[model samples]
Structures are given as structure tokens and as C-alpha cells.
Target: TGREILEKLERREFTREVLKEALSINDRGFNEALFKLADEIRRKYVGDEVHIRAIIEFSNVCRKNCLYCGLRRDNKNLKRYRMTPEEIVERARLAVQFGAKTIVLQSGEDPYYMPDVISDIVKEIKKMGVAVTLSLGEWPREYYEKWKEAGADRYLLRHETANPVLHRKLRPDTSFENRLNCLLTLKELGYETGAGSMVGLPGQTIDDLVDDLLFLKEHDFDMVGIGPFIPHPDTPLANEKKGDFTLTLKMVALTRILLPDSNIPATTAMGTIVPGGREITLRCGANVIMPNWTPSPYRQLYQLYPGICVFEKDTACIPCVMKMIELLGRKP
Candidate 1:
């Protein structure tokens, strides 16, 4: 019974095995009950404040060949672009003007912008009195220390999937050990570290999902960004079916129950899968909304997955998201 499990969860008495059993739930009525309890837990612990962060996808160029991403190096069809440090900082300023208290600088692993270039950008954004978070993919530990020295407040590096074999299969050129090491190093450098995984990955099992949940509990991250696996046409995984949005929501809700203090975003990828999906996540457990504030021209180019809010004008994106947040009875 989901109610019994929910009671155990409320008491914080459920073990990882029980959590794994919860993940196996597919019956709609039982799932709804689970989400209901999850929403209640969210209200009790994290409250209604939704932290809307601005994500500026400054570049589309990357060096890795991940099977799941559109920005992989082998995607020759992608028109590569990189914003100048001046442009990037100015964009961050615009986001702050639009009521964004946190500015996320995101880009693929493009080495063109040297460590100092990124450090300089971080320094300039920090001057705006807004939190700075970087999602610039894996880098040397020294670079992580350099960014921290430049006053970076947070760092996001998703593990994508926790199963090492599946992780290697999806990201052949990259190592699972290196990915985990980067996340560990980020935490060691005092960055508010975020790590997450994809839901409903191809060949992924229930056990893999359990590992991800346990991994999050073990890491006790400051932030978590769980999104459904949306297959990009250009990638090797083009034929793979998209991840189940409901399961993604369940994962988000469960994440909130397990790590009550962590910042969880209703990811844009959720919105891509269904209409008003981001709003749905906000109700379930998500307390953060990372709206894409990148310039319109480049927003469409930085396509990690299809159907992103690429068409929305930067001027209207934040306002629209705020309206949605308010309508859902959550503060932005």
C-alpha cells in the first residue's frame, strides 16, 4: 500500500529498499497518493518560495561526444557559437534587472574560453550581488579551485545516470570515475555542489534508478536537477524513446522528501515534454525554476534537446514564468 509507504516516509523510517519498491509503482491511483504525500512533505519542509534562476547558455561548442546530447563534438551540423566575456556579463546584468537573483553561466565543454576567461566572467557577475552558478561541464580540479577563487557560489554537474556501465555506454569518451571525482572535487572546493541523473534512460533498470536515489542521499547535494531523458535526433540515441514524465515527477517529489533542504528545479526539459509541465513540478516538490534568459538568437542554437523554450523572447520569459509560479500559489 502506497499509504503505508507514505506513512513510513513521513516518519523518515523508510529504507532504500522500500524506496526502490516505491519507484516500481505504475498504478495511477497509487502514484497520485504518493505525489499527494510528497506535496504535503514539500510544503512542510521547503515551503512555497520558488527561487527562479536565470540560465544563460553562452556557448554551444563542446569537446565531448556524449551519446545523449546534441552539443557533442561530432555534431558537425550544429552551428557552433560562443559569447564574448563582455556579452556574457552584460546578459547576466540584464537577467538581474529582470529580478533574477541567481545567474547561471552554462555552456558545453568549450576550452576556447580559458579558465581565466571564465574566472573573469564569474568575477564580473559576482559584482551584481547575484549568486553565480556554473554548468560548464567537467574540468580539471585546479580550474574548479580557480572558479571558486573567483567567487563562484554554486556548480552543477549532472551524473546523467548512476550505473557505471550505462554511464560509460552513453558517454564513451568520458569516465564514470572522472565524473564522480569532478562532483566530489566541486564540493571540496566549497561550491554549493549539484549532481543529478536522467530518468527512463535506454536499457536502464529499476535498480539503476534506485542507485541514483541512494547516490543523491549519500552525496547530500546542495542542489539537484533531475530531468527526463529527451533523445535528440542528431545524437546516437535518436531512436530511443523519451523518458516518462510522470516518473521524472515522482523522482523529483522523492528527491524533495529525501533531501528537504536541497534546491530542486522544475527543469525546462519537463516543460518540453508536456504543456505546463514545469508548473506541475512546482506543485509536486520543485522549489526552483531556471528559466532560459539567453539571447534569442543563441538560445535556439544551444539545443541540448528539442522543444526547449527557445522560441520565447528573453524579455517575456521571466515574466511568463513568474506568472505561472504565482498562479500555482508559489512565490517566485
Candidate 2:
């Protein structure tokens, strides 16, 4: 029974079979029970604070053409935008003003921002008394070392999937091993490390999702972001079905149960998939909300998937999410 499986998971006896059965849950009553247990684990382990990791998508340019991403180099329709190092620092300053203790510097893999360039930005933003997180796509170990030296505190490099074959097929430019190595390297380098996956990617099976949970538990990353895969019209996978809504929420709950103290975000991708997505996610064990601090129209330009709010500028957006967090009765 799913309730027994949840009980075993709560007890920390996470067998592969137990994980598989947990993810395969389809009963409505059991789903509620699973979320309730996950919420209990979340509060007991991590407390009631739903932290905000302010994100600025500083660039949309990329070097890789992953089949599912809208920012793939081949998508000429995307209005490319790259902020200078000085401008990025300015944005970080504003993010700090918005009460962000952690600022996430996100961009596609645009090598144009050289190592020194980003390191300088990190150094500047670090002075604002906020922890800095980097999501610039796969760079070499040397570059990572430089940024960490410049005071970058965390890194977000989602593995995208756990199935090795599906991982390669989705990200043709890199191997699954390479991706995992990067995640491992981030941990070794002393960054507050994170990795995650999209729910319902093409060819991703329930078994693969179980493998993903096992991977997260094995690594015990500082953060994990689980969200639905929304197909982008500009990408090759445009015709593929969007990830199942309930399944994505279940993944988030299970992850909270699996790694209770980890910072799991109610991703923008969740909000994009369904109205009031983050609200539901918060109740289901998500403890973070990464609201866009990217100054629009650049915010609008960094569209990874459709349905991301086009008009929500940080001026109003940051205050809005903060208020929403307040209304939810969780500490800011």
C-alpha cells in the first residue's frame, strides 16, 4: 500500500522498490496521504521559512541546442539579450533591495561572458551581503573555481533526467556522465550544490524518475528543483505533450520526504503549467520560491517556456511574492 510505502520512506528505509512504488501512486486518497507526510517531514526538518532565491536571467544566449529549450542557439525567434557585467551587478543590487538573501545569476551557456567577467560580477554582488548562486550552463572546472573564489555561494545545474540514454538524447552535446560529473564537481568545490530534473520529458519513464530520486538522495544536494516539462514552440520537442500536473507535484512531495532539509523550489515552471501552481507546491513541501528579479523586458526575453508571466516586472513582482508568502502564514 502507498501508505506503508510513505511510512517506510518516513522511517528512512528507502529501497529502490519502495521508491518505484511511491512514484507509481495513482490513488487520490494515497496521494493526499503522501503530501501530508511530506509536509510533516518538511516542517520537522527544515522549518516553516519559505526562502526566496531571487533570480535574474542575465542572458538568454546559449552555445548548446538542447531539443526542449527555447533558448537553444538555433531559435532565431528568441530576442537574444546579454547584460554587461556592470549591469548584472546593478541587477544584483536591486535583488538585494528586494530582500533577497540569495541572488541567483542565471543565463544560458553563453561563453561570451568570459571567466574574469563573471568572477568580477560575483565579487561585486558578494559585497551586497547576499549569497550568490550561479546557473550559467556547463563551464569548465577552472571557470567554476574562479567564480567560487569570487564568492559565489551556490550552483544550480539540473541533470534534466536520470535515464542515461534519455539524458543524452535530450542534450546531444553532452553525455549523462559529463552532467553528473559536473554536479559532483560542484559539491567537491565547496559550493552549496544543487541538481534537478523536469517531470515527463520525452521517453522518461517512472523507473527513470525513481532513479532521479535515488540520485538526489545519494548526493544530498543543498537544493533540488522539480518542475513540469512544458514544451516550447521554438524547440524540436514543440509537439510533445506537457508534463502531467499531478505527477510533477508528487515528485516535489516525494523529494521533500526523501531529502527533508534540502531547499526545493516551487519553480516558475510549476506556475507556468497551472494557475496558482506555486501555492499548491508550497503546501506540498516546497520551501522556496525563486521570483524573477530580472528587469523586464529582459525578464520577458529569457523565456525558457511559454506561460511565464510576461508583464510581472520585479518592481511589483518581488513585493507581490513576498506578500503571497506572508498570506501563506510562512515566514519570509
Candidate 3:
């Protein structure tokens, strides 16, 4: 029966029910078969190029208070910091030197960086001949238009979950409707948009996970980031058990099966769950790796979740991640 479903998937004849079945796969034999098929499909559609984007987390001061995030506004233990626009541009220059074709400028939803400030940084990076992806949380459509005009090429706004109830419960002060609208707006503005979900969120369900997969396909996102939920000590879900790593990988595989050409990253969060987790994912379905390019002083400070591999410098992390990618038979 699983083999039949795999064939259907290869033919692009899969349905949500088939995806549900794939998600429920637990037996080792069936599981490996599913992953093998996903890998085949991945190679067919995306080839062996594993694009590495360097993520520079320039700020840790978040304005929103999410339940599972370590950088939530309620966490007073974190020392708040923000990089000057010049410093951010300089980091982008260094990341380009280290072989990053894309530079992702990420920060909490802090408003201190005004529209002109962000636009200037985007312009500076674009001048260096690299695509820019912004992960600054929800902002007005005018700001979106401003950044797009300034040469920002992509925007990542993870939906986090598909269920409305769980969305509200976890991300206080935000709504599912608003999140969906933001994604729609990003799409309308012609930025290659990205949206994702978290596996094993406190009350997330299988159906919700299925909805997430279908949603990404429906939206036709250019990038999809799926990672396991790791509890943060200072947040409300601190004591909750971590998400299952295998299931998260399965989700990554299924995503590739569904959106065959979309960029799926071997998230650092994956490595936090298991050793060599990113390498494991690259073999299955992932084709992207986002190495940390944040400066030495602020690498560990921008904690979205715990157990992220932080380095004193990008020297060690860059070589190690590349070695892992090479070992998995993928080019970085």
C-alpha cells in the first residue's frame, strides 16, 4: 500500500489523504521507502545544488511575545542589542566573501529600524550583487513596497501553524487571519514569499500538519522552512517535550514531494535536535543550508530556540557545514 502511494507521488497523483498516510508512516521499512522516493523526486526536479544562505541575526529586541520563542519581549534576561546599518552592511560584505549568494537579514519585530533605514541596508547589500531575504516580522504593506523597491528579493514569514486556535494560543497579539493576509500581501507585491509551520507545537495536530503541507503547495511559496519545535527555557512552553526529529524530517521530505522545486532548508534547528541533522536532511529532500553569519559577539544572543550551534566565529561553522554537505554528496 505504501509502495502504491509512493508511485502515485512520483506521478504527481498525490492527495491530502495520501500526505496524511505518509505522515503517519512509522515503520522503518516504509519510512525509508518514502524518503528514498522523496530523494529521487528531489534530484529529478532540483538537482544537486545545495544553496547556502548566510543568516545574519542583527537584532534580538523583539516587540511581540510569542509563547515558544526565546527572544520573546517578556524575557528580561536577554540583553537587547541592535546593529547599526553600517555594521549590518559590513557583515553582508563578509558573508559574500564567505560564499553566500543570498544574505538573510533577520531580526525580531523591532520598529527601531525605520523604513528608510531598512531600505538603505537592502540597497547596500544589493549593490554587492547578492539576493536579500528579510525576516523582520510583520510590517505595513507600505514598508513591504519600500523594501521591494530597494531591491530586497525575498521575504520569509513563517505561518508557524495552520490551525487558528493554536496560532492565537501560541503567538499572543497576532491572529491567523492577519498572518495569512500578510503572506498574501507579500505574494501580491512580487517578493518570492516563504511561509512555514512548526512540528510538535504544544497543541498542534496531525491534521494541522497536513493543512500546512497543502497550504504551502496552494500558496506556491518560493521557500518553505519546516523545523522541529524546541522548547525555550524562558518561554511559556519551556517544560514541554521537544518535537520528534524523524517526523520533522518526514515533513521535509513530504514538502519536497509536494513542492518539488521550492527551496527547503536544512535548518540549524534540525542540528539542535540531533547531531549531523542537517546532513541527514540534505540526503532526504533539503537543498539549502543557512549557515550562521552573525558576528561573534551576537551569535548566541539571538536565540529563537535553545540548543542552536553557536560559534565564536563563522570560520568553524562554515567549514563544518560545508564538509557535512559534501559528505552527503551535495554541493554547497
Candidate 4:
């Protein structure tokens, strides 16, 4: 019966109930079948291109306090830091040199860096001919237009959760309607947009996970990032249990099945939950490995969650990632 469900899902006959059923089960045999079909669809649709998206966490400052994030503004324990525009470009240059074709500039919603500042950074990095993905929480629509015109290729604004009530509660200062509107605006402007959810958030349910998948499918976004919610000590949800490993893996697989050609990453949170966890996900459906290229000292301070690669340097991280992908029989 499990195998039959896999065939139906693969045939693109997926329904909300069917997807909920898939996420509800946790047998090893069913997992194997689900993953095998997901991997097969991955090869057929996206082939062997394992994207190396080098990430540089440029700042740790934020304007709003989300209950679940370590970088929340209220977390005075984190040593906050911000890089100059030139310093940001230099990091991108080095990341490009060390085999990073795409550079993701991620930060909390820091207002110190204005629209002009980010536009300049994007323009400078564009000269290196690498794809640029920005993840600076939220920005005005005009700012989005300015960056897009400056050659920023993509933007990642994770919806975080699909439930409206839980979403509002997590980030009390923000509106759920405005969040979705921002995503809609990014899509309208033609950015290779990305939006995803946390698998095991404090009140996140199987139905919410299903809603996330359906949302991605409906939007047809170019990129999707699904990762487990790892707790951080400074955040309010520090004591909550982390998302289940196998359940998170199944979410990745289901995302691959639904959004066949979308760029899905086996995130660092995946690696943190279980050692070599990204490699385990590589066989299922994930095709991207985003190694941190953020320079040290600062990298260690920009802790979104506990147990991330806080110990490694970018110089070593790239080669190690290449080796891991190569061993997984994918093009790095």
C-alpha cells in the first residue's frame, strides 16, 4: 500500500490528504520506497547538477524579535557584528575564487544597511559573474526593485510556517498578510524566488507541513529550502525538541516529488541534527549543498541555531563539501 502511494504521488496525482498520509507514516520500508521514487524523479527532472551555494552571513543584527530565531533582536547574548560594503564584496570575491558559483548574502532584518548599500554590494559582486541570492529577512518593494536592477539574481524569504496564527505568534511584530505579499511581490518582479517552512516548529503540525508543500507547488518558485528547526539557547524555544530527522527527510523527499525541478538544499541544520546528514539527504531528493563562506570570528557569532558548522573555516568547508558530493555520485 505504501509503494502504491509512492506511484500515485510520482504520477503527479497528489492530494492534500494523500500528502498528509505520506507525512504521517514512519516505516523504514515505506521511507525507502518514498525516497527511491523521489530520487528517481530528481534524476529525471534536474539531473546531476549539485549546486554549491556559498553562504556569507554578513550581519547578526535584527529589527524584529522572532521567538524561534537566535538572531532575534532581543537576544543580547549574541555578539552583534556588521561588515562594510567593500568587506562584503571581498568575501564574495573569495567565495567565487574557491569554487562558489553562487553567493548567498544572508542576515537578520538589519536596517543599518540601507537599500543603496545593498544595491552597491550586489553590483560589485555581479562583476564576478556569480549568481547572487539575498536573504536579508524583509525589505521594501522598492528596495527589492533596486536590488533586482542591480543584478541580484534570487531572494530567499522563508515563510517559516504555513499556519497564520502560529506565524503571527512567532514573529509578533510582523503581519502574515504582509509576509505573503512580499513573496508575491518578489515573484511578480521575476526573481528566482524561494519560500519554505520549518519542519518541527513549536506548534507546527503535519497539516502545516502539507500546507507548506502545497504553497510551494502553487507558487512554482524556482528554489525551495526545507530544513529542521534546531533550537537555540538565546531564543524562547530553546528547550523545545528539535524536528525529527526522518520526518524532515521525508519532507525534503515530498518537496522534490511535488516541485520536481526546484532547487532543494540539504541544509546545514540537516547536517547539525545528524553528522553527515546532508549526504544522507543527497540520496533522497536534495541536490544543493550550501557551505558557509562567512569569514571566521563573525561566522561563529552569527548563530541562527545551535550545533551548526561554527567550528570550520570556508577554506576547508568547500573542498570537504566537494568530496562529500563527489562520493554521493553527483556533480559538485
- Which residue pairs of candidate 4 clash? none
Query: Candidate 2: where is the Cα deviation over 4 Å?
Result: none
TM-score of 3: 0.97
How big is the positional error of residue 119 in model 2, measured in Å on the Cα after superposition? 0.5
lDDT string, candidate 1, 110-215, tens digits: 9988599999999999998989999999899989989999999999999888999999999988878889999999888899999999997899988888889889
Q: Can you give the TM-score per candidate against the true fold?
A: 0.98, 0.98, 0.97, 0.98
lDDT scores of the candidates, listed in order: 0.88, 0.88, 0.88, 0.88
Candidate 4 global CA lDDT score: 0.88
Candidate 2 CA-lDDT value = 0.88
Worst 10 residues of 2 by lDDT: 306-315
> How many residue pairs in model 1 have overlapping backbones?
0
- Model 2, 242-277: lDDT tens digits are 998899999999899888989999998888889899
Q: Write the per-residue lDDT of candidate 3 for residues 33-146, one digit (tens) a residue.
A: 878877887899999999989989999998999999999999988878899999999989988988889999999988998588999999999998999999998999999999
TM-score of 1: 0.98
Candidate 1, poorest ten consecutive residues by summed lDDT = 306-315
Residues 137-165, candidate 4: write the lDDT tens digits. Answer: 77789999999999989999998887889
> How many backbone clashes does every candidate have?
0, 0, 0, 0
